[PDB]
Amino acid sequence: IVIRLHEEYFLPGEVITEQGNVVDHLYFVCEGLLEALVTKTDGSEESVTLLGPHTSFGDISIICNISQPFTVRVCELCHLLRLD
Amino acid sequence: KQSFSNILEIYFHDGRTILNNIMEEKESNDRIKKLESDIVIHIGKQEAELALKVNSAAFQGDFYQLKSLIRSGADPNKTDYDGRS
């Protein structure tokens, strides 16, 4: 797993993944908080999950089927890892 | 136009008011864009043709295409005009 990791940094307020993009990478989360939300038909939707350190992100999409739901826009600085 | 359609599909109810807006405006300010013909029949025909297309899709059983069509602003309760669900 470690032999194929590439880093990436986002300032608080960046869209990482949403419904439009299919799975392309295994975004792992380092120190920092990224907001996970989804969409609705009323002001969309807010407060799905607040991902923290030592967790995963965008795993079920590669696990079973393409497309990455749970539109995520980051909320804090974090040194996310990325695996193909 | 592409992003307008791609955002009407998500805010379908909002574009629903949007066509309401344009038609009520044609009622009031007829000199703006009423100089043509009726449009409500055209939107009804769009809905009816999408219904016939989803009928054909159910005949072909395309799960992805049927899901995309239904979520693209289609009412699932609308069956064949005769009534074939």
Short mmCIF file of C-alpha atoms in Angstrom, two decimals, chain A residues 4-80:
data_model
loop_
_atom_site.label_atom_id
_atom_site.label_comp_id
_atom_site.label_asym_id
_atom_site.label_seq_id
_atom_site.Cartn_x
_atom_site.Cartn_y
_atom_site.Cartn_z
CA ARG A 4 2.05 3.68 -4.31
CA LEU A 5 1.07 6.79 -2.33
CA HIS A 6 1.07 10.41 -3.52
CA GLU A 7 0.34 13.39 -1.27
CA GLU A 8 -2.02 16.31 -1.90
CA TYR A 9 -2.92 19.42 0.12
CA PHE A 10 -6.16 21.44 0.12
CA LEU A 11 -7.00 24.63 2.00
CA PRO A 12 -10.26 24.73 4.02
CA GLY A 13 -12.97 25.19 1.41
CA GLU A 14 -12.05 22.87 -1.50
CA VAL A 15 -14.31 20.37 -3.25
CA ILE A 16 -12.50 17.04 -3.42
CA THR A 17 -15.12 14.55 -4.60
CA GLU A 18 -18.81 14.75 -5.44
CA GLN A 19 -21.48 12.68 -7.19
CA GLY A 20 -20.37 13.81 -10.65
CA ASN A 21 -16.92 12.24 -10.46
CA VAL A 22 -16.56 8.46 -10.44
CA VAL A 23 -13.92 6.79 -8.27
CA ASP A 24 -10.39 7.45 -9.49
CA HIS A 25 -8.27 7.32 -6.34
CA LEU A 26 -8.23 6.17 -2.72
CA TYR A 27 -8.19 9.50 -0.88
CA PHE A 28 -6.78 8.82 2.57
CA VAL A 29 -7.05 11.57 5.18
CA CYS A 30 -4.17 12.87 7.30
CA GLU A 31 -4.32 15.48 10.09
CA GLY A 32 -7.24 17.78 9.27
CA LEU A 33 -11.02 17.92 8.93
CA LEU A 34 -12.96 17.64 5.67
CA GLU A 35 -16.72 18.08 5.57
CA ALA A 36 -18.82 15.31 4.01
CA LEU A 37 -22.26 16.32 2.71
CA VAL A 38 -24.83 15.12 0.19
CA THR A 39 -27.39 16.89 -2.01
CA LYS A 40 -31.14 17.35 -1.58
CA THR A 41 -33.94 19.24 -3.36
CA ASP A 42 -34.02 21.85 -0.53
CA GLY A 43 -30.93 23.96 -0.03
CA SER A 44 -29.22 20.65 -0.81
CA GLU A 45 -28.11 18.77 2.32
CA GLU A 46 -25.74 19.56 5.17
CA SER A 47 -23.86 17.64 7.88
CA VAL A 48 -23.43 14.07 6.61
CA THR A 49 -20.13 13.23 8.36
CA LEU A 50 -17.03 15.02 9.63
CA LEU A 51 -14.07 12.83 8.67
CA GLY A 52 -11.08 12.88 10.99
CA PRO A 53 -7.53 11.54 11.13
CA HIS A 54 -6.75 7.82 10.91
CA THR A 55 -9.83 7.17 8.78
CA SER A 56 -10.58 6.39 5.14
CA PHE A 57 -12.44 8.27 2.41
CA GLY A 58 -13.84 7.18 -0.95
CA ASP A 59 -13.43 3.44 -0.42
CA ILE A 60 -16.82 1.86 -1.15
CA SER A 61 -16.77 3.26 -4.69
CA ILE A 62 -13.73 1.18 -5.60
CA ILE A 63 -14.94 -1.64 -3.33
CA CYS A 64 -18.23 -2.33 -5.13
CA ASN A 65 -19.21 0.09 -7.91
CA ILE A 66 -18.12 3.33 -9.57
CA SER A 67 -19.34 6.87 -8.75
CA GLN A 68 -18.45 8.50 -5.42
CA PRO A 69 -21.51 9.81 -3.55
CA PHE A 70 -21.41 12.01 -0.44
CA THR A 71 -20.16 15.26 -1.96
CA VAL A 72 -17.18 16.32 0.16
CA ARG A 73 -15.90 19.88 0.47
CA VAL A 74 -12.92 20.19 2.80
CA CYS A 75 -13.17 22.31 5.95
CA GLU A 76 -9.61 22.28 7.36
CA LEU A 77 -6.06 21.92 6.10
CA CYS A 78 -5.01 18.30 5.69
CA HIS A 79 -2.25 16.33 3.97
CA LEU A 80 -4.43 13.75 2.23
#
